[PDB]
Design a protein around this ligand. Structure first.
Ligand SMILES: NC(=O)[C@H]1CCC(=O)N([C@H]2CCCc3ccccc32)C1
Ligand SMILES: [Zn+2]
Length: 139
C-alpha cells in the first residue's frame, strides 16, 4: 500500500484504488497501473522533474529503504495476476531489489522529489510506475 499526495491530488496504484478514489476520479490508465483522485486537504509531496536513474525506495515487506539504479520508463511485459491479464505495462522502470505484491505503493525518490511508486516485482526485481511525465499534478 501507499500513495503520493501532491496539491489536491492523490496518486495510487490503479489496482489498489478504493471506492472513494473512483468516486473522486481525475485520471486513470490501466496500461500504467495508475489512478489519480482529488482530495480536499492539500498535499505537500514534491514530484521530481528530471531524468535521474538512481534513487531510494521504501520496501514495506522489509520495513526498509533501499538505494537503486533503475531503467528509463518503458513498455515492459508483466505476467498475469488477479488484477490484470499478462500485458505490456507502459511507463515502467525496473531495478534490482526486493518487492512482493503488498509492496505496491512504496515511493521511489531521487534528490528532486518523488519519481514513482512500486507497481511490479518478483525474482529479485522491483518495478516502479513513473509519475515524472504527469506535469499537470503541479497545477
Ligand atoms: N502492475 C501489475 O500488473 C501488478 C498487479 C498486482 C500484482 O500483484 N502484481 C504482481 C505480479 C507478480 C509479482 C509481484 C511482485 C511485486 C508486486 C506486484 C507483483 C503486478
Ligand atoms: Zn531526479
Amino acid at each position: 500500500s501507499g500513495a503520493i499526495y501532491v496539491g489536491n491530488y492523490r496518486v495510487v496504484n490503479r489496482h489498489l484504488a478504493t471506492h472513494n478514489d473512483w468516486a473522486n476520479l481525475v485520471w486513470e490508465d490501466s496500461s500504467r497501473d495508475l489512478l489519480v483522485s482529488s482530495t480536499t486537504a492539500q498535499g505537500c509531496d514534491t514530484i521530481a522533474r528530471c531524468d535521474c536513474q538512481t534513487g531510494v525506495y521504501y520496501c514495506s515487506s522489509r520495513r526498509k529503504h533501499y538505494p537503486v539504479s533503475f531503467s528509463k520508463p518503458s513498455l515492459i511485459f508483466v505476467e498475469a495476476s488477479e488484477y490484470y491479464p499478462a500485458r505490456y505495462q507502459s511507463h515502467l522502470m525496473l531495478a534490482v531489489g526486493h518487492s512482493e505484491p503488498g509492496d505496491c505503493g512504496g515511493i521511489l525518490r531521487c534528490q528532486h522529489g518523488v519519481v514513482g511508486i512500486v507497481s511490479t516485482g518478483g525474482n529479485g526485481l522491483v518495478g516502479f510506475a513513473d509519475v515524472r511525465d504527469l506535469l499537470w499534478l503541479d497545477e
